Symmetry: D2
Subunit: 404 residues, 4 copies
């Protein structure tokens, strides 16, 4: 639900003195937001849920052809009529067959036939339309408070400490205030109506899969169709072959399923999960994250007085940061972790910066663990933890591409 470890992570820095930041969150992106005097926040799109889908029409890709009958007349006795032309379920076709004395006619020549067969649809793809007002954006937010290697990405654990929440914004309720315990509150003013091209396509369901197809390409589809406004199948003939007629009988058969060809045409189309409501992969939700009522807690606790150790030594996170896990030996917590990223032990001016702002031991229990993410400078530096003569340190070297 938060960012550390994700492939797609971006860092957004609030401008100087600004209590808010503009965000563009997408289906796959995880954003880490850092603003002056604010705890660091992760924000990520979880999903987009469109609920009230309405059918536009259906196409049969697999038809059933049964109950074939042919009525026949001799040459010169007029056109055959098959009484099944009265049943709207049946497809009928006028034809002719060679007749003569050998097959029951007094005259030789073309005898009339009329051949019918029941058409039913075995499998159909249903096209549905999305209404822009029935679109829920679900978003996860995480505050970089105290966490461990083990629990950092554990949602229920972070909810536990008032350090994460999930919430929904809709066109109708595009703004949400959510309290984060002692951190106070953040609001998100989003623009859910300018997030998705809702009506430039349909949701089409084909078997176990559903797609986002063009709504024009969908109309031009060459298959038998039904609408709410036309319950009877039209263009049924597309899925049927009237075979060669002979004497007084004629075969009629349905094509095999056309599903495979649909998945063919549906190559570059987005795939989406559909049950009662559709879940959209692609998100483009703009939001303003407001942090005027968010606070950095723990900024004035006394500094932890006892020794720390590295439970996990620093590793490059691949996001242009470095992360450690500390274990704190003391039982004087809650307390502020003295930690800085410096150029040398002889000069303690902070040159690196913390992503986990204001790292904090939050319990009086001994040996609790605290994960800290930071951005050391390029070249050599040291991570120095602890104060006075309890300090520990670790060298770091941050480099980039080798020669090439």
């Amino acid at each position: 639900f938060n960012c550390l470890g994700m492939g797609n992570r971006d860092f957004i820095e609030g401008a100087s003195g600004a209590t808010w930041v503009d965000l563009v969150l997408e289906g796959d992106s995880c954003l880490t937001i850092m603003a002056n005097d604010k705890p660091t926040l992760d924000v990520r799109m979880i999903n987009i849920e469109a609920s009230q889908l309405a059918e536009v029409r259906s196409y049969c890709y697999h038809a059933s052809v049964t109950d074939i009958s042919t009525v026949a007349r001799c040459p010169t006795t007029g056109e055959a009529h098959n009484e099944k032309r009265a049943d709207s379920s049946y497809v009928c076709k006028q034809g002719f067959t060679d007749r003569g004395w050998g097959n029951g006619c007094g005259f030789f020549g073309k005898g009339s036939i009329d051949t019918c067969a029941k058409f039913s649809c075995t499998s159909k793809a249903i096209g549905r339309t999305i209404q822009p007002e029935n679109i829920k954006y679900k978003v996860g937010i995480f505050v970089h408070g105290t966490t461990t290697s083990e629990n950092h990405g554990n949602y229920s654990a972070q909810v536990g400490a008032s350090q994460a929440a999930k919430f929904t914004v809709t066109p109708n309720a595009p703004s949400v205030t959510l309290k984060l315990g002692d951190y106070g509150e953040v609001t998100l003013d989003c623009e859910p109506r300018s997030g998705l091209n809702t009506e430039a396509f349909y949701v089409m369901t084909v078997g176990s899969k559903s797609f986002l197809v063009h709504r024009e390409w969908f109309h031009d589809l060459a298959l038998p169709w039904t609408s709410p406004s036309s319950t009877a199948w039209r263009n049924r003939e597309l899925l049927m072959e009237f075979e060669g007629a002979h004497a007084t009988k004629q075969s009629v058969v349905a094509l095999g399923s056309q599903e495979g060809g649909l998945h063919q045409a549906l190559a570059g189309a987005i795939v989406v999960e559909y049950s009662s409501s559709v879940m959209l992969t692609s998100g483009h939700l703009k939001c303003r994250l407001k942090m005027d009522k968010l606070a950095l807690k723990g900024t004035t606790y006394g500094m932890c007085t006892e020794k720390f150790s590295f439970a996990k030594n620093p590793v490059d996170t691949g996001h242009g940061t470095v992360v450690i896990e500390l274990s704190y030996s003391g039982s004087d917590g809650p307390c502020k972790i003295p930690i800085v990223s410096v150029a040398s032990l002889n000069d303690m001016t902070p040159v690196g910066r913390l992503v986990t702002v204001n790292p904090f031991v939050a319990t009086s229990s001994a040996n609790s663990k605290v994960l800290v993410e930071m951005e050391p400078p390029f070249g050599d530096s040291y991570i120095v933890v602890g104060r006075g003569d309890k300090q520990i340190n670790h060298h770091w070297h941050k480099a980039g591409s080798t020669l090439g």
Copy 2:
């Protein structure tokens, strides 16, 4: 099995003094052969049977993907190996997933994965090749002896009177003599090796249907294949999608059946029935029909002496002939029917001609029926039946297209 009534009927006239005629018989054609002093014959291709088909290869159009497993390793610990790479039934694929502290790795970055799945073919199309020496042409022959409206097209009935037979010619036995009772014998010298382009294509079986496809188009088919010379499926990946991998697991699924797309590509291809042997629609069999030992029987019987009547009045057959059915009142048969097609009753010179040459009452039973086909001249003429003062007659007018 014979021609009267068929849509596709041609008339072939033996040349003057010639005891044989060259014939080209095709899948659908019925030939009526008339030669000097010979009874009229119908000859038609019944079918072409290729027996000893040999597989060239098979293509899977519907695959089954099961037993998916993924083995995963952390970044810097090397490439994952999935032990299923040892099973030739499984398709495997190297991949990578984002790993870090959050999903069990001491280091952040791309962790190796190796994902396998069993591939089995649910439905395959089998391509077979025809051997030009294993091709039977089955042919029906009919002699225009005595027949009735009722029995004319009845094979067992004509076999009864020695007036029809069926027979086979092969490359190995391309000539057949067949006795036709008192009519004697006819031989057919055919050229079965110059009848079919046997090796310019394959017989391909797709579900319940079989087709004659190009043997080059068949090689270029993009599907997983097996040969007798390679029992293991190759190019299996064509019917599989390795889905997105995440952490330590990855989905793998088979495409749906591709059958429908095959019937698509198989539009202008010939359809053929295949069980143990294939039956070919298209025939082009050249034969010489030899009639030197065939005779017109009944040419010197006494003329029937009693009255005839028209059981069926003359009708245009649509083949440029006219057909009647006579009933013969006499019991002096077997006897020759006196019948001619003349310009007027005052001039009995034959101007029309008989297709049923030498019509004959073949029994002493009273009231037997005899069908007679003939070609009256254009304009007015008369069909005159009987001799002396027992004669009956019917006017005929033969016209063509109205003004236009």
Copy 3:
């Protein structure tokens, strides 16, 4: 201008007692109309002329790319601007090139460029629309009066004898009365508005040829376009390739002509001649031909008394008629030609019928020629010309398909 000899000739027979006949005349068809007590008429569509074509838009299929210039800036000095972006005749494109000390920049990296080139259209296809009210149908009519082998199909010659005319019908003037001398007058009430699908397509001109293209297919054309409502070429880039940029210069070239590809897409499209006005191949003009004021002249002249001869013996015209040319030896004309088509010389009842109704020698000059078309019965008949003991005759036999 009339029918004898044409491939596409139909015969239309006025109904009994009817002074008018409904006609459907098409681009290629020639109609012979026969009505009771009326001279026989030929009617044929000559052409359809749409005049007031209006442009809908134009597409350039061959462009000229000239006067290329590139303006370049060093990395860190900002985006290059090419002053030709002010000229609407020029197409411009922002780019980048590798820069460094070696090519005049204090800094290494991507330097900005801006490259322009003049676009002019060398050859364009112009799409025009037809207005249904500006459509002239030109029609030729011919009356089967006296004609010779030589002059029968000679328009100026028939106009000479008041036996042919040409005339126009428009939506605005859909009815025309035209006098035919002593034959009186015929009127044609046509429906020019229900003759052509005028607005389901455009007239498109590509070089020396013009076509009737879909008006939707025409919009979707992927070429640079101009309208009367937009005089500047849009989508010019379609006919240009901006080549690879290097340092401070970049090549830009036009594609070659696209004309050939248009003729490719224009395969099944109708071809039409366009100059000031378009001439349409396809006609479907409905007319009522009214003959209440048309008369058969010559019906009561005295019968020609002298000998005729066959200047040309009877030949099958291939239209289900037979035509002769007579020479008339007498100088008693104008006079009625006694000619009939009979079953035998011993029975002069007319059984054949004249297409050239009331054949007539129209001059007192000796040895004038008169062409006569007729429809003899099937089988044998005679053409008997002259009266009393001056009569000549010719046998005719009319047959149809040989046996087959």
Copy 4:
């Protein structure tokens, strides 16, 4: 001809103690080679020249159709023969036209015609094949001796100082020794036969452009063709339309040029310059560069004693290096430039490394300039130039991606 500034530059490091290095040089790549105790070398592919191209065949894409004639005969008089069927330059076609009395025939029906027209090819595309033994690889080599900002990329200037050469390798002479003055000699053993897929395609020339097309796709081309083995155009009809024949005349015209459609099919095909010989864009030439007889000159000259200055301050080259230009005030040259890249002025241990190994003032003239490229460590360092109390220095900070 050398690398500094190029977009595509790679750095190759000779292995420890190794006097040779394996290189893969490609059409666009520039390689900088650094080996122990050797001057740094740049090596780049300049081009690949295939000379002895042989035609395989030619296709006409633009035909000229002229001198049309039609010979015609009346129905029943037999087939027309056009005497131009004797000229191999003419394309002829049998046809039929409606004939009758109106256009000079005694009989009505289909009259025979035979229509011919001269075919000449206006423009043709010629397909040529490359012989793997006639392929020259041209290669530029540069030694990182003394150079200035101004002359570094100036070939004639570097040849001047024995610091660059160009040379050719062929299948027949795949190895080249080239002397570089006081630097000694380098040899390149290349594998020109394993560099290009010479015979998997043809060189096809279409107007002003030439392409590398498949040699199979080239055979299947549907255009009129000629080979050295068949000087007469075959399949000419592809570029001609025999228009509708009428009476005794028939139009015949050539299609327009097909060139545009070729450039269409030739989208993803490589473009190459062809005159007498072809120049190939794509190179893949493997070479072993041997440096056993190459030496670092100047390694034991006395250190320059006077002051340097920065003529150009250090800039990031975008290749993961930094380059400066020094001006040397002294006139004691030739002399060794003391220059090092250190962590701090208080610790002169070299931590950065020189790409311009052993930088050297090569003249006694005052104020000569010397360019130096180097790779400082990440973070802070200093470039220190000069010895004793004549030293100058410049701070450097090398960083990478900002937070994100």
